Design a protein around this ligand. Structure first.
Ligand code: 8GP
Ligand code: 8GP
Ligand code: PLP
Ligand code: PLP
Lengths: 810, 810
């Protein structure tokens, strides 16, 4: 059908069709008379999978031959989403499969909707890992993603009575055609036990063993025939485990629970033992694999030349003391040598500055679960503080501030401090975030070792986030500048010479309208809810959290509603406000915000006077697959976190690449986005980081805004009186109380400017031509936000490897 | 190589080789440089599996078209063993695969040893189900085996310090290439809840739901292109199950534990709740499947004409009240009509008369777990006893004896009584066993409904138990009478005309010697233990139980040892005594017997004076795959259970078919075997059932034998003094005490005759020619014991269907 989807050759379409029928018969054991759509999806998946194996085997053989430096990306989350379409895109098989299935009397788009998302992540952090794997494969790096194969990923969200209900994400129910179990590479992981100090070295004994079984998933690069590996570990009990008889066998579950479920927290630390086990489990199994592969290439001096370990936040921080343990206790290297190797091998990426999100494990937990690691951590702390003491003689407070060990009620280990001390590089994920790290939370560390601190602004893959989810836009763009931009996004700048092109302006606007129509139809199909495709699509999709301020969005929505009720026959640009995102199960305030959103919709959506001028919809079960649908359909992207709280944000980049304008604060990557497109082409509002600090120094008093802003006062009074909860008048008492007395994110402080800015948005939307021209200026300057750029920087500035766009023989 | 293994055609060997390489590449994702023997086994398994699918799909399509009466064999055990070789044999692919793998530089026998046994059974009962599935497919019956897919089958037995150690049988670790998950046919099963009596009918509400996910395994008939299905259910928790968040997800294990492990008891009832759940789980899911299939063919009058349900013992007895529940509560049929249909549909097979093995569930368990079923059972009991009262007016004791409800300490439900009342046919598994059922335990029922009682002597499949495990013997036999006997075992009688044939006598003896050499080599390979291939192989393999009397065998062994020590330079026929079998984990006496066996070996095997004249080896981890190795190598088969305790036995038949002579009591099928071959060609000894009864009436006093038999006295004194346990003098105090004071199986009573009989065995072994001629007379008359004969009788006399030897188009 369209160019960017590849060729539908005669031979290939014929070949695909026969292999499809082969798998349906031999693999699924079915016939066209009893096969269901799910059967067809699997037949198609196995057919596409076959095309991956050849490349997968030779890519790995290639790395064995050339023995390049290996990159190991350790993460407890990989938010992959669906794999079928992405694989077809990267292998240039989309049109061929489209034609082949068409000839078989099947609609491929229908089959793609059957695949379950691999939701092994919570949000931004997990999605970043997924985009990174795609980019590393596309740039020809010998990279491996290592994590845990959770039996249950992020929970599926159901909305009942306006409340969030959680249900298990049994994503493996029907099987996973993409993974390949590798039981032959099963490795043992140790827990508990005690440390024994003998003549030569310490020994960790009397441990409980849990086996780590790996499952490999192929990661195809974009049309370069490279196929890397994502290896996820699954917990298995040894067969002699606990070996009445029946009970012993049933208790195997205790050990296998390690890989059972993903902790559903976004930017929040929960110090649970099971989570610590998951963290050590992935680290212990991964490091043995890394060392095994390294020896199969004694000379650990070259270890840093052949290995790079990237820690995605502090979750896998135990890799530092585990590497020391192996080198010192097992390989018998002297401490100093082992430390040198460890530091040169490890690099750490920080993803947040919120205090409640930092990992600080109670010493008593480490003491019982990983006694040898605790000892190693104390030794690391001791030698590190000696270095600090020598650099800043007499500065006793600095010593207590920089210690890896925190004193107080319960002693804790600051994992972020552990990571900085044991890594040769520490980076933030957006320029403003990296600067904040050096000026505030890690200031002491920056003064001691300035060279370690870097910035690596996040990015998103243009394959999944443009070509895959928005073929219409990818097509009109290719028509003008070719297809080279898909793997070199900076080329989009060439579109700047079309900002005055009447044909292009028309096509861009047409693509957006078609996406909105397609999405508006979807909302009625799977969720039965009518919306006006001619209205401005105002959307805020991301995890629910106070710092992201979905509440500020809510205040604007109610303001719009009250203004209409006040002057009904006055014209206002029609809007469809869409808010979606999951709340962590134990995050009460977040769950109350979801309820507030649906409650607002319950009133606004049924008010005769409002008509189709304003609609408030809460997008249920926001996940990667839904993001691929709603982002291409958006007109306005809400990125309104309080300045200084959103480390980077990545959803913001997805919206910019897909033709939506942005209303946001100068926070995270929003700053660089506005800088790239020009502030005149961005809707910036609110306090800057400096303004927030001034307010804190003076003392934030929400009452002041309530007293001086009549419209704000009205909203709070409506909330308090039960206007949005007739049957339960005080239902939102907690929300009002927080807003009025202990709002850490200063919602009221940005209210006036936000509402004012929103008026400017509506004004521009009334002029289709100028709205679209500004959109082109955004799309054209979004090149910097490709994860290919991000990965190229990690490769050159941290890992010490050169990216390559060279194709491998297929 | 040999005839019976099929043709190794040019085209097929070429085709096999290419598909082997295809699977190794695409399916296993490997190359010849990194592939291990396990990888090769799987590539071969998938290649053979492909040949099954075509036939599997058309067989099932065939049944849908012709809509024949369906046979449902319900069992909680299916002791399948390995599947690769069996599939090749039944598809006539053995020589072709042998050649194809040979050309690829691989030894197929080596690859076959890699497959894990599907050990979803304990012993005879489970193996019978497996042989039956093979025969039903070979006789063209539209049959389905229904059971549970245990994650862990019978435990693997390790011997440590002469003691049995159990370890989990993680048979699914590397995957199961034979099964096909069918998540689309998942069905709900209910537990707990309460009964609500409304206007029209009762309702079972407030139940906890567990999902039953089926896994289908193909069952190929012998060269007739028929491929039936064995459907095993796996327990899955619903996604809204228990829906802190993490705990709720982790507790899903509670529900999924239902299909976690096989209860390891052989002829012993353990009233545990989890076992009851397993029993209802298989019954509930299976019946919905049966009814679904029946409706997809309202008129339940024809239900018995299209459905036959065979209950393998009482384990699935809940099928009776569950069928009533569905017909009455859900389909709204009147009780009388529903009962008529139920009785005509169900048939019950009893497998033992030992009191401790009968299922008698506490009413309080059924009351809580299956409240509606308890009510239905009481109603059944009420109507049944009214029938008894009308047939035997005034016989109040008969009423209490025949009740399904047993009174006493705790009220219990006798499941055997439930089965007889609700089945149109009840059968024993050997003539003597079926007679005992009518004369003793079920005498009252027989007098009420004589027509229900039948006999169906057990059998074994000649495919697995001759062709597969003993190709050498199958070959020399085919050379004389052709291959027709493999599916018509009665033809072996033609071998009687070769009993005087010098060439045949030589070949038979040669095959046995080769098997013994092959086994003697295996013992050194995997277990490092030297044995003399020229000695008589005396073997007793079967589960360890007091009624099977491995202890009587032990007494003879020690007698042989003491006789040698007494007259060292006297000649005695060399023997290798082999005993193997697992003991239930909680069966203390059984575990002590295993220890005694190894203790005897510890003394006998290292006594210089004995030399290679006597060896006692305990065969570790006896299972189907080991049976296929040791049975063809045996000279003497020990079937010495106390008369009246072994319902049938099937191991006895395997030995007879493979060239071993039998020493045994007139118990179970031994009686019919001796009758078929002629008592002169069998080594019968001991009390008959009548003799045992006389002894009980008089009172069994072991002391009497101890006082009158000097050799027996010596053995008991050696045991009591610690002769076989120097470091632990009283180690066997429990054994001696039981033998002397409370031996329910009268070991001493048969000692003299047993030892005398054993002398006659040794005398015949000294004359190779006459020993072999008697062997031929046994092999030649073993035809009656083919499970094809057994199944043909079930088909005609119970299920009402005609067996067919007609091939289906491949
Ligand atoms: O869960 C997260 N962080 C702490 C729990 C470790 C997490 O997802 N942080 C997220 O990481 C993304 C990619 O770097 C950024 O775009 C987001 O701003 C940040 O919140
Ligand atoms: O476990 C068993 N029986 C009771 C526990 C139900 C069982 O395996 N019984 C066995 O069934 C075999 C086949 O019919 C017979 O050959 C054996 O004699 C009988 O013990
Ligand atoms: C991109 C993405 C995110 C991150 O969104 P932000 O607005 O940066 O927090 C979260 N969830 C999903 C499903 C995403 O695709
Ligand atoms: C045949 C068989 C049995 C039954 O043996 P009996 O001696 O009849 O009890 C038990 N276990 C295995 C593995 C078998 O093959």
């Amino acid at each position: 059908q369209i160019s960017v989807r590849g060729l539908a050759g005669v031979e290939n379409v014929t070949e695909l069709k026969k292999n499809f029928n082969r798998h349906l018969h031999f693999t699924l054991v079915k016939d066209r008379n009893v096969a269901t759509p799910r059967d067809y999806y699997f037949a198609l998946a196995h057919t596409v999978r076959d095309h991956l194996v050849g490349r997968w085997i030779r890519t790995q053989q290639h790395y064995y031959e050339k023995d390049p430096k290996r990159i190991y990306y350790l993460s407890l989350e990989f938010y992959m989403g669906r794999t079928l379409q992405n694989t077809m895109v990267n292998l240039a098989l989309e049109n061929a499969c489209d034609e082949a299935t068409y000839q078989l009397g099947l609609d491929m788009e229908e089959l793609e909707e059957i695949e379950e998302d691999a939701g092994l992540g919570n949000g931004g952090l997990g999605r970043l890992a997924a985009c990174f794997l795609d980019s590393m494969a596309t740039l020809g790096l010998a990279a491996y993603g290592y994590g845990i194969r959770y039996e249950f990923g992020i929970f599926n969200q159901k909305i009942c009575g306006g409340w969030q209900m959680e249900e298990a994400d049994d994503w493996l129910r029907y099987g996973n055609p993409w993974e390949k179990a590798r039981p032959e590479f099963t490795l043992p992981v140790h827990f508990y036990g005690r440390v024994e100090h003998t003549s030569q070295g310490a020994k960790w004994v009397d441990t409980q063993v849990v086996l780590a079984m790996p499952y490999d998933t192929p990661v195809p690069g974009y049309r370069n025939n490279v196929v890397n590996t994502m290896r996820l570990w699954s917990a298995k009990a040894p067969n002699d485990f606990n070996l009445g008889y029946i009970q012993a066998v049933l208790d195997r579950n205790l050990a296998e629970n390690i890989s059972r479920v993903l902790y559903p927290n976004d930017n929040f630390f929960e110090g649970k033992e099971l989570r610590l086990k998951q963290e050590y489990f992935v680290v212990a199994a991964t490091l043995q694999d890394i060392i095994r592969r390294f020896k199969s290439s004694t000379n650990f001096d070259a270890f840093p030349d052949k290995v790079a370990i990237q820690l995605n936040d502090t979750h896998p921080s135990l890799a530092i003391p585990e590497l020391m343990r192996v080198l010192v206790d097992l390989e018998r290297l002297d401490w100093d040598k082992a430390w040198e190797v460890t530091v040169k091998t490890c690099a750490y990426t920080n993803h947040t500055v919120l205090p409640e999100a930092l990992e600080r494990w109670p010493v008593h937990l480490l003491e019982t679960l990983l006694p040898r690691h605790l000892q190693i951590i104390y030794e690391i702390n001791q030698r590190f503080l000696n270095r600090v003491a020598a650099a800043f003689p007499g500065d006793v407070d600095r010593l207590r501030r920089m210690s890896l060990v925190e004193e107080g009620a319960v002693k804790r280990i600051n994992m972020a401090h552990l990571c900085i001390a044991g890594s040769h590089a520490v980076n933030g994920v957006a320029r403003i975030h990296s600067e904040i790290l050096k000026k505030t939370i890690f200031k002491d560390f920056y003064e001691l070792e300035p060279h370690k601190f870097q910035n690596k602004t996040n990015g998103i893959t243009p394959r999944r986030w443009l070509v895959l989810c928005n073929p219409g836009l990818a097509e009109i763009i290719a028509e003008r500048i070719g297809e080279e931009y898909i793997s070199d996004l900076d080329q989009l700048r060439k579109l700047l010479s079309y900002v005055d092109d009447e044909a292009f302006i028309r096509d861009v606007a047409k693509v957006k309208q078609e996406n909105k129509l397609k999405f508006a139809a979807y909302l009625e199909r799977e969720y039965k809810v009518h919306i006006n495709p001619n209205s401005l699509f105002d959307v805020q999709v991301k995890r629910i959290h106070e710092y992201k301020r979905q509440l500020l969005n809510c205040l604007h929505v109610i303001t719009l509603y009250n203004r209409i009720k006040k002057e009904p026959n006055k014209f206002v640009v029609p809007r469809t406000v869409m808010i979606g995102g999951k709340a962590a199960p134990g995050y009460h305030m977040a769950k109350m915000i979801i309820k507030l959103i649906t409650a607002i919709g319950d009133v606004v959506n049924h008010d005769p006077v409002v008509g189709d001028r304003l609609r408030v919809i809460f997008l249920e079960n926001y996940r990667v697959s839904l993001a691929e649908k709603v982002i291409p359909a958006a007109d306005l992207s809400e990125q309104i976190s309080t300045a200084g709280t959103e480390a980077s944000g990545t959803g913001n980049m997805k919206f910019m690449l897909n033709g939506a304008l942005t209303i946001g604060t100068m926070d995270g990557a929003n700053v660089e986005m506005a800088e790239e497109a020009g502030e005149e082409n961005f809707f910036i509002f609110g306090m800057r980081v400096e303004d927030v600090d001034r307010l804190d120094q003076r003392g934030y008093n929400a009452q002041e805004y309530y007293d001086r802003i009549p419209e704000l006062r009205q909203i709070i009074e409506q909330l308090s009186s039960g206007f949005f909860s007739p049957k339960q008048p005080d239902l939102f008492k907690d929300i009002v109380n927080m807003l009025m007395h202990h709002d850490r994110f200063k919602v009221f402080a940005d209210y006036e400017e936000y509402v004012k800015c929103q008026e400017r948005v509506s004004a521009l939307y009334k002029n289709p031509r100028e709205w679209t021209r500004m959109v082109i200026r955004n799309i054209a300057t979004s090149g910097k936000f490709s994860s290919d750029r991000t990965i190229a920087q990690y490769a050159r500035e941290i890992w010490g490897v050169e990216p390559s766009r060279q194709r491998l023989p297929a």
